[PDB]
RNA sequence: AUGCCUGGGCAGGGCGAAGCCAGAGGAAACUCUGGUGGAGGUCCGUAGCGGUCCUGACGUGCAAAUCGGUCGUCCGACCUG
RNA sequence: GGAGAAGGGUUCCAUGUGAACAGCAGUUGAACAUGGGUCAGUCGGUCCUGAGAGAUGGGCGAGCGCCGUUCCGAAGGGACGGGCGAUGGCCUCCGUUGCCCUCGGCCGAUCGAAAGGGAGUCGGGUUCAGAUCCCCGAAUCCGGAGUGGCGGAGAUGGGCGCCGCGAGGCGUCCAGUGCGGUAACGCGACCGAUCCCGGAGAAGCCGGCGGGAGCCCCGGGGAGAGUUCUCUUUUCUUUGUGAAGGGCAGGGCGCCCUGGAAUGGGUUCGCCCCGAGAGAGGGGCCCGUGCCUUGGAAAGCGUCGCGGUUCCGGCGGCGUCCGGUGAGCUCUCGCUGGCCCUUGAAAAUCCGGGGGAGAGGGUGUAAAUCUCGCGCCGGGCCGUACCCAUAUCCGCAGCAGGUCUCCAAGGUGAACAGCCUCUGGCAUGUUGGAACAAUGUAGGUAAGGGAAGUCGGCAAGCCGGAUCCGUAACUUCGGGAUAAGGAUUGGCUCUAAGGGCUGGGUCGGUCGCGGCCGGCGCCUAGCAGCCGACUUAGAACUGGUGCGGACCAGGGGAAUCCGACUGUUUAAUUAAAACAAAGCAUCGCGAAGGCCCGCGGCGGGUGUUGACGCGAUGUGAUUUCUGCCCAGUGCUCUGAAUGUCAAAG
RNA sequence: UAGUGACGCGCAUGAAUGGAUGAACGAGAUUCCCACUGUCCCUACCUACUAUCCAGCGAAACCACAGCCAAGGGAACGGGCU
C-alpha cells in the first residue's frame, strides 16, 4: 500500500493543514489541501438557533467574488434576518403603533373631559 | 432501588469522598441536572447552562436563577417583599 | 521552577452511576425481574510520562548518572512544542 | 521505510588522490582537491492581533534614565457636497493643487506567531544533483481599466389624432432605478451617499450513530509471470484520471403550503417531538470531497514488435474490464447527547440589511451597474540544495544519552500487544581468525526434602487468556471481587439458531413484452426466487491426556502500624508515614480599606475585584468527641478617673 | 529479645500542638499460613558473549630507591638496620 507525505513544509496537523486523498491520472494517490468549511449567516434576531436559507455557505472573503443574488434573498431584511422574524417584526410594529394611537386618543379624551 | 440501594446519582463517585459528603452532594446534583418546566412556553425543557444560568430549548429564553436550583427561596421571598413594597408605595 | 497565549497527542478490554423500556406483585405507597444506557480526578493494560527492587550490569563505562529485567500511572491535579 | 519543523551551513551532486582523519583495513567516506547545483501572484515570510513589549503627553529622578499605556493632552492633516482661485492637457471635458464652508468618536505611535486568523494551482514530463518554482496543458485570485473594448440588463409599453387592406409609418400625452411563486424562495444583472444594525472570520473535552472517500477482503475477465518429480481452470504484480465549470445521485434543515390528532401517535442504538400544530401528502434551501460530462486519451501505466553502430525523450498493435461485501483501519462530513463552583481568544478582512441625502434622459436616449458573459495590462522583495538522527543537531566524538510532527499492508490474535511475512532499508552497529581453561555477564535444567539459607522468601519459581459454576469477614452499601475455590480448551465431520432484495394488481378490453381502464385474489396464518457478513450452542469420531501446546499472560489468605483516597516531591544515594488535597475552624478588611510590591511619582498587584469576595493561618476523607486553665508570653478593647513620657510651644 | 490479643503501674500517651475509629486504596513498615521453587542440604551440567592465543591498532592510574622471611631494637607493627 502506497504511503504519502505532506507536499508543504508545515508538518503539524493544524487547522490550516487539513488535506484529503485524490487519485491523479498518473494512478497515484496524493494530498489535496482543502478550504475551510463555510457557515451560513445567522439571523439578526438572535432567538432562532438555525441559520438563514438562500445564502451560500462559503468563507467570508469568498463573498467578495460571489454575486449579489447568492448573498441574499428577495425579501425585506433578506440575507440578514429570517422570514419568521421579519413577519413578527411587521405584526409587532403595527400592533404597537395602533396601541399608541389608542392611548393617544384616550389621553386626548381625558384632556377634553377636564 | 432497581440497580442501587441508597446512592443513586452519586454512584459515579464510588467509595471515595465519604458517605456524608456524597449524601450532601446528591440533592445538589439531582437539582442541578433536573429539567424544569418553563413558565413561558409550558414545556419541561428548562435546563441549567452555567452557574445561575437557565435556558429553554423551545422558547430560547435565558433566565438568571440559582446556582443549583431554578428558583431560590430567598429570591422568591425578596420578590414578594418587593411587590408588597411597590403596592404600598405607588398605591 | 511557576503563571499566561497559541498549537499537537493519548491501542485494546473489565466493572457498570443517572436516565429509559417491558413483564410481575400491590388497594395505595410503591416493590421485584429482564433489558437499554455509558458516568467515573474507576480498574487491567500499550504509546507517552516517571523511576520501586534486583541495593543487577557498568563503575579510568555507551554515558561527568547510561543499560537489562521487574515496576507506578496511563481522560485527568494528563503529556508536550 | 518515505517526508518535514528547530538546529547545522555546503555536510547535496560529478570527477580525481589516498599525504593526514574515519581507535583493523580500504580500491570506500559526511576526508582532501577541482568544478556544479536552490528558478514562485497561487508554497511560506510579507498583513492581523493574542499573552506581552514599548514611544509621545504626564510624573519622578543628581544623572545615564526610570514610572505608566490612557492615565495631570488643542492627540483625527482624513472625507464627501458646495463656492472661489490657478495650471495642465483638442483650457468643450477632466485631473491635480491651494483656500473657504461642511462632515467625522474611538482608544492609542509601533512591535509581537514560517504550528493561531489570512483571497487565489493543479496534472504530465523533465536534472548527476532544483522543481505545486523549469517545459507542456489546463485554471484561478487581487489590482487597474480614463478615452469604456464589445454584447447584454435600466428597453423600447399604453392612450389619443392621422395615413395604409394589412404588416407597418408619422405627430402628441405620459409610465418605465427588473421579473416569478400563497409561501419557503427563485431568475445572468437588476441606482445610490453621510449614518445605523447584524453576520462571517470566531471556537472546550468526551460518548453514540449515519453518509462519503482511501486501504484491506471475496467471485470473476485480460496482460506479464514462479511451480509443475504428484496435484492445483495455478499462485504472484497491475488493471486510472487533476483543479476549475455544468448535470445528477446521497446526506441535513430549529424551512414552507393543505389539516387538525386520545383508542394518543411518530420515532432512535440511546434520545426525543407534537394544538406554540404530531402522523399523511406537495414543495423549498444548504453541503454535495461521491457518479457522468469539458478538461481527456492527444497524456500515464502493463504488455508484444521495431527504426537508429552511435546520437536519438521515437514509432506502432493491444488492454487499462464486470460485480459483492464487512461493530474492518484512517481521513472527512453531519446529527444527537454527557461534564464544568472549568463555559473554552482577539484583530485584520469580507458581506448582507434599515433609510433615502442625491443622479439621470425625457420617449430614444442617459446616470447606474456590491458587474451578467467575455476581452486587455500587471503582480515587486526575501527563503527554496541536503541531514532532520544508533554518522550531517546538542552532549569535547560517527558518544547504547537527549531532541517537535505526518503517512501506516497480510496472517495469528480483543488489540497500534508479542511472533512471521510483502513494499521499502541494511550489513549486525570503532576490527577479523583459532580453541571452548578457571573466574565472570546474560539465559536455563536439576533426583529426595521444601525456606531447614538469609537481618529479611533478596533472587527465582508458582498462578496467568477465554467459557461454564461458585465467591467469605467487613463495609461509607458504592465495594471487597478476577475474592478464595473448581471443570473445559486440539483436530476433523455434522446439526440447530441469529438476515436482506425482488416477485401476485393474475381476467377482459384497449394502445404501442410494456402502458391505461373495471370488478375480481386483496399472501393482511405468507410464501417463491436470488444473494451476503460473521457468530453462538449442541452432537459424533479421533490422536501415546495432547490441546490459552510458540507468543501474549494476576501467586493467594489471616492480621498489626501509618497515610482517607487520585496526585506531588530531594534532575545525580532517601517516592516515604514526607508535601499537597476536598472537608473543618479561626483572623483582617465596606475602598483615602485589608494584604503586598516599589529609592522615587495623582506609582503598582489582588482588581475586568466588593464579604457566597480578597488576603493570613492551623488541622487534614466518613463517624464520634473536642475536657479544664488567661498564672506567664502574645494579640485585642476603652480610658483625661492617669504614674512615666521627646520635640515644639 | 519477633507477631497478635488483654493489664496499667504511662521515665516521658492524650484530645484541630487534634484523641479514638475507620470501607476502598498504597512500587509504604512488620507476623503467620497455603502453593511454589537450587535460598539451602550440595552441588553439577548446557548455551551465548568475554576472559585465552594470533594479525592489525593501541592508552591510563601509579612510580624516594625498590621489592623472600623469623626475632631484636627503633617514632613502642621494617623491604633496607643487627
Ligand atoms: Mg499559519
Ligand atoms: Mg548497584
Ligand atoms: Mg570492571
Ligand atoms: Mg526516515
Ligand atoms: Mg556524498
Ligand atoms: Mg584506521
Ligand atoms: Mg506584526
Ligand atoms: Mg411533520
Ligand atoms: Mg528540500
Ligand atoms: Mg556508530
Ligand atoms: Mg553480534
Ligand atoms: Mg561488522
Ligand atoms: Mg530439586
Ligand atoms: Mg521477588
Ligand atoms: Mg481480600
Ligand atoms: Mg490496636
Ligand atoms: Mg498516600
Ligand atoms: Mg535522587
Ligand atoms: Mg530511588
Ligand atoms: Mg491554631
Ligand atoms: Mg494573657
Ligand atoms: Mg520467624
Ligand atoms: Mg504532655
Ligand atoms: Mg503531641
Ligand atoms: Mg615500607
Ligand atoms: Zn431569526
Ligand atoms: Zn419555554
Amino acid at each position: 500500500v502506497q504511503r504519502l507525505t505532506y507536499r508543504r513544509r508545515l508538518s503539524y496537523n493544524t487547522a490550516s493543514n487539513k488535506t484529503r486523498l485524490s487519485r491523479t491520472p498518473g494512478n497515484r494517490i496524493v494530498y489535496l489541501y482543502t478550504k475551510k468549511v463555510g457557515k451560513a449567516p445567522k439571523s439578526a434576531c438572535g432567538v432562532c438557533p438555525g441559520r438563514l436559507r438562500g445564502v451560500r455557505a462559503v468563507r467570508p472573503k469568498v463573498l467578495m467574488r460571489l454575486s449579489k443574488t447568492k448573498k441574499h434573498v428577495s425579501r425585506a431584511y433578506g440575507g440578514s434576518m429570517c422570514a419568521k422574524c421579519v413577519r413578527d417584526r411587521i405584526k409587532r410594529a403595527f400592533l404597537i403603533e395602533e396601541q399608541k394611537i389608542v392611548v393617544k386618543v384616550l389621553k386626548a379624551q381625558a384632556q377634553s373631559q377636564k | 432501588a432497581k440497580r442501587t440501594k441508597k446512592v443513586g446519582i452519586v454512584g459515579k463517585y464510588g467509595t471515595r469522598y465519604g458517605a456524608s459528603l456524597r449524601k450532601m452532594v446528591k440533592k445538589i446534583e439531582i437539582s442541578q441536572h433536573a429539567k424544569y418546566t418553563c413558565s413561558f412556553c409550558g414545556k419541561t425543557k428548562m435546563k441549567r447552562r452555567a452557574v445561575g444560568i437557565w435556558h429553554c430549548g423551545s422558547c430560547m429564553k435565558t433566565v438568571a436563577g440559582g446556582a443549583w436550583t431554578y428558583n431560590t427561596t430567598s429570591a422568591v421571598t425578596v420578590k414578594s417583599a418587593i411587590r408588597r413594597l411597590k403596592e404600598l408605595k405607588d398605591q
Side-chain angles (χ1 to χ4, degrees):
Chain A
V1 176
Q2 178 187 1
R3 289 172 288 184
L4 26 69
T5 71
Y6 279 149
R7 216 188 301 185
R8 301 177 185 178
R9 294 188 183 271
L10 177 52
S11 61
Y12 304 108
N13 182 260
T14 62
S16 302
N17 203 22
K18 296 303 175 61
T19 61
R20 72 175 177 91
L21 300 181
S22 180
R23 192 188 306 271
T24 63
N27 202 339
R28 60 188 183 98
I29 303 297
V30 300
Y31 263 153
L32 278 186
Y33 295 81
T34 65
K35 307 303 179 303
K36 291 186 176 180
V37 175
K39 292 188 178 183
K42 194 172 58 181
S43 181
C45 62
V47 61
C48 297
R51 297 192 173 276
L52 196 42
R53 285 76 51 188
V55 181
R56 293 175 58 96
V58 301
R59 300 304 297 181
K61 212 171 304 178
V62 183
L63 296 173
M64 188 181 185
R65 315 192 290 266
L66 205 57
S67 181
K68 191 176 185 61
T69 303
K70 279 90 71 171
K71 291 183 296 185
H72 73 77
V73 80
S74 183
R75 286 186 295 99
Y77 297 84
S80 60
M81 191 176 298
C82 61
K84 171 185 178 180
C85 299
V86 173
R87 177 167 38 194
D88 296 4
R89 293 296 186 87
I90 298 168
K91 288 185 300 181
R92 184 182 309 273
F94 174 76
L95 266 306
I96 297 283
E97 290 297 333
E98 196 71 16
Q99 180 67 21
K100 288 187 183 303
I101 292 301
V102 172
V103 170
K104 186 257 298 181
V105 169
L106 182 60
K107 193 171 187 176
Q109 187 275 341
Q111 298 294 335
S112 61
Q113 185 273 346
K114 61 178 61 179
Chain B
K2 175 61 180 61
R3 291 185 294 260
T4 58
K5 183 178 182 179
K6 58 185 61 179
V7 284
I9 184 59
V10 295
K12 61 178 180 182
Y13 294 145
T15 329
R16 303 172 291 274
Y17 317 137
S20 181
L21 266 55
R22 284 186 280 102
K23 178 185 305 178
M24 189 182 310
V25 84
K26 176 175 181 179
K27 308 307 169 184
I28 299 301
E29 292 284 347
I30 293 181
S31 304
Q32 170 188 0
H33 294 140
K35 305 185 66 177
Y36 294 87
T37 296
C38 168
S39 61
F40 300 96
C41 66
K43 308 184 187 61
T44 313
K45 294 192 61 58
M46 266 298 177
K47 188 181 179 301
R48 179 180 174 271
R49 170 179 292 176
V51 212
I53 296 179
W54 297 82
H55 185 78
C56 174
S58 301
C59 290
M60 301 299 302
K61 284 187 175 298
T62 305
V63 182
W68 323 111
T69 176
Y70 180 79
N71 284 131
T72 60
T73 61
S74 179
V76 180
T77 302
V78 166
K79 180 180 180 61
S80 179
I82 289 308
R83 186 256 309 278
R84 185 191 309 267
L85 289 183
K86 182 183 186 302
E87 292 188 0
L88 264 55
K89 165 186 169 59
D90 201 320
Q91 294 287 353

